């Protein structure tokens, strides 16, 4: 009840944040903290709506931020919590501080397809060319866009296509056509990593760090950055946080280059603080696994928070219908 409560999505990703950021920053500030886990920012909304907020810091996505901010779920962060020039443009708002870049990408089972696995969203959606069990997230960010890409939309026109009612309906129709081949709608990064380790799916759209972690654990899977979504993860403080002031100081400390440099030590993620790269001096081998590496960025498209700030409610309901058809 006296400790700052920080929450992310568990598994290897939470363990990496706790080791590189939370435990060293709390030690430097001589403070005590408690961890929690959640999969959707709507759980932070529920706390705000119930009138009993227990979480202080929440780890959310860059495209969750406009929605959460509009719903009054987030506190406004103190000015100069970070220097905006040290982070990618748009990754730091008045209610969010980025901690990393990651990819929502295609991974496939080498026992099923060998080296000849799906290398694009058109291939992921091609049950004729690639027969097998698919796994998709139970939340729509990266999933609606995957269907738009599968329909032939160029990566740079994804959100131009999803700007019309016609494009949005076509993306849902493409997901509905794929739905009978979707054996599991994964709910957490650790569950997606477990599906990969057990070879329970033939192909999956999930986060790069989770995929690489499963492969490091022995999974006979391969993956590509082609047609992947370049995402941004970060921190926000819950509106009415019981330890708001202490949380603000903790978030300021953990955003520093000295902690950020250690974030990809074992977990395949890309630090958001640009000064971390100079401090750590990552090997080319290390850089190649990073979502934000130039060669990887070249075959990706960035998530658009402006799209999600407008059509999240529609996407949630329509995507729920696609999954509820099973």
Binding site for Ca ion (CB under 5 A): 11-12, 190, 193, 207, 209-210
Give CA 131 to chain center in angstroms.
Answer: 27
| Least distance (Å) between residue 31 CB and Ca ion | 27
In the complex, what is the shortest distance from the CB of residue 281 to ligand SNW, in angstroms, rounded to a whole number?
20
Pick 103 or 224: Cβ nearer ligand SNW: 103
61 binds ligand SNW (CB under 6 A): yes
Least Å distance, CB 231 to Ca ion, is: 9
The encoded tokens of residue 25 equal: 């920053």
Task: Name the phi and psi angles at 204, rounded to 5.
Answer: -150, 145
Of 247, 211, 216, 253, the residue nearest 228 (C-alpha): 211
Closest by alpha carbon to 240, among 11, 42, 50? 50
Between CA 284 and CA 275 the distance in angstroms is 17
What does the alpha-carbon distance between residue 104 and residue 91 come to, in Å, rounded to a whole number? 17
Q: Does 8 bind ligand SNW (CB under 6 A)?
A: yes
Our finding on whether 102 is near ligand SNW (CB under 6 A) is: yes
Q: What span, in angstroms and rounded, lies between the C-alpha atoms of 57 and 4?
A: 8
User: Helical H runs in 100-155?
Assistant: 110-113, 121-124, 143-150
What whole-number distance in Å separates Cα of residue 252 and Cα of residue 207? 26
Specify the pairing of strand 57-61 against strand 301-302: unpaired
Residue window 205-224: x/- pattern of binding to ligand SNW, with contact defined by CB under 6 A = --x-xx--------------
Q: Shortest approach of Ca ion to residue 6 CB, angstroms?
A: 18
To the nearest whole angstrom, how small is the minimum distance from the Cβ of residue 139 to ligand SNW? Answer: 6
Residue 189 engages ligand SNW in binding (rule: CB under 6 A): yes
Match 């960025």 to its residue by tokens.
297
Q: Give whichever of 224 and 232 is closer to ligand SNW, judged by the CB atom.
A: 232
CA 112 to chain centre: 27
Q: Which of residues 62-81 bind ligand SNW (CB under 6 A)?
A: 64
Which listed residue (100, 212, 255, 302) binds ligand SNW by CB under 6 A?
A: 100
Alpha carbon distance, N-terminus to C-terminus of the chain: 42
Query: Among ligand SNW, Ca ion, none, what binds residue 239 when CB lies within 5 to 8 Å by partner kind?
Result: none
Q: How far apart (Å, rounded) are the C-alpha atoms in residues 90 and 73?
A: 20
Q: Considering CB under 6 A, how many residues would be counted as binding ligand SNW? A: 17
Write the Ramachandran bin of 186: left for phi over 0, alpha for psi from -120 to 50, otherwise beta: beta
Specify whether the CB–CB gap between 39 and 75 falls below 8 A: no
Residue 266 neighbours by CB under 8 Å, 6+ apart: 16
193 binds, among ligand SNW, Ca ion, none (CB under 5 to 8 A by kind): Ca ion
Residues 266-305 that bind ligand SNW (CB under 6 A): 269
Interaction pattern, residues 12-31, with ligand SNW; x per rule: CB under 6 A: -x------------------
Please report how close the Cβ of residue 2 comes to ligand SNW at its closest, in angstroms. 26
Q: Which does 61 bind (CB under 5 to 8 A by kind): ligand SNW, Ca ion, none?
A: ligand SNW
Nearest approach, Cβ of 193 to ligand SNW (angstroms)? 9
Least separation in angstroms between residue 13's CB and ligand SNW is: 4
Span interacting with ligand SNW, options 203-211, 243-251, 276-284, 298-306, rule CB under 6 A: 203-211
Positions touching ligand SNW (CB under 6 A) are 8-9, 13, 39-40, 59-61, 64, 100, 102, 189, 207, 209-210, 233, 269
């Amino acid at each position: 009840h006296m400790d700052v409560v920080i929450a992310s999505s568990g598994g290897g990703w939470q363990e990496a944040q706790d080791k590189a950021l939370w435990a060293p920053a709390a030690k430097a500030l001589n403070i005590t903290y408690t961890q929690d886990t959640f999969q959707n920012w709507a759980e932070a909304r529920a706390q705000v709506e119930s009138g009993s907020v227990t979480w202080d810091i929440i780890q959310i996505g860059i495209a969750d931020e406009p929605q959460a901010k509009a719903a009054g779920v987030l506190e406004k962060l103190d000015p100069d919590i970070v220097n905006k020039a040290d982070f990618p443009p748009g990754s730091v708002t008045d209610s969010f501080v980025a901690n990393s870049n990651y990819s929502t990408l295609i991974a496939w089972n080498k026992k099923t397809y060998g080296d000849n696995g799906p290398k694009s969203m058109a291939d992921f959606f091609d049950v004729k060319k690639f027969p097998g069990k698919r796994a998709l997230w139970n939340q729509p960010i990266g999933m609606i866009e995957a269907a738009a890409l599968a329909l032939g939309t160029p990566r740079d026109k994804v959100y131009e296509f999803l700007s019309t009612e016609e494009g949005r309906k076509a993306a849902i129709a493409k997901l509905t056509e794929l739905a009978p081949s979707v054996s599991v709608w994964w709910e957490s990064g650790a569950q997606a990593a477990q599906l990969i380790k057990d070879g329970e799916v033939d192909m999956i759209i999930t986060w790069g760090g989770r995929v690489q972690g499963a492969i490091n654990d022995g999974a006979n899977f391969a993956y590509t950055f082609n047609d992947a979504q370049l995402g941004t993860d970060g921190y926000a403080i819950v509106k009415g946080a019981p330890h708001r002031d202490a949380a603000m100081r903790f978030l300021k400390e953990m955003s520093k280059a000295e902690y950020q440099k250690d974030l990809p030590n074992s977990f395949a993620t890309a630090p958001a603080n640009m000064k971390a790269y100079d401090l750590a001096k990552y090997t080319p081998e290390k850089m190649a696994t990073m979502a934000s590496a130039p060669e990887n960025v070249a075959v990706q498209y960035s998530v658009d928070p402006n799209f999600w700030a407008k059509h999240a409610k529609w996407a949630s309901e329509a995507y729920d219908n696609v999954r509820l058809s099973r």
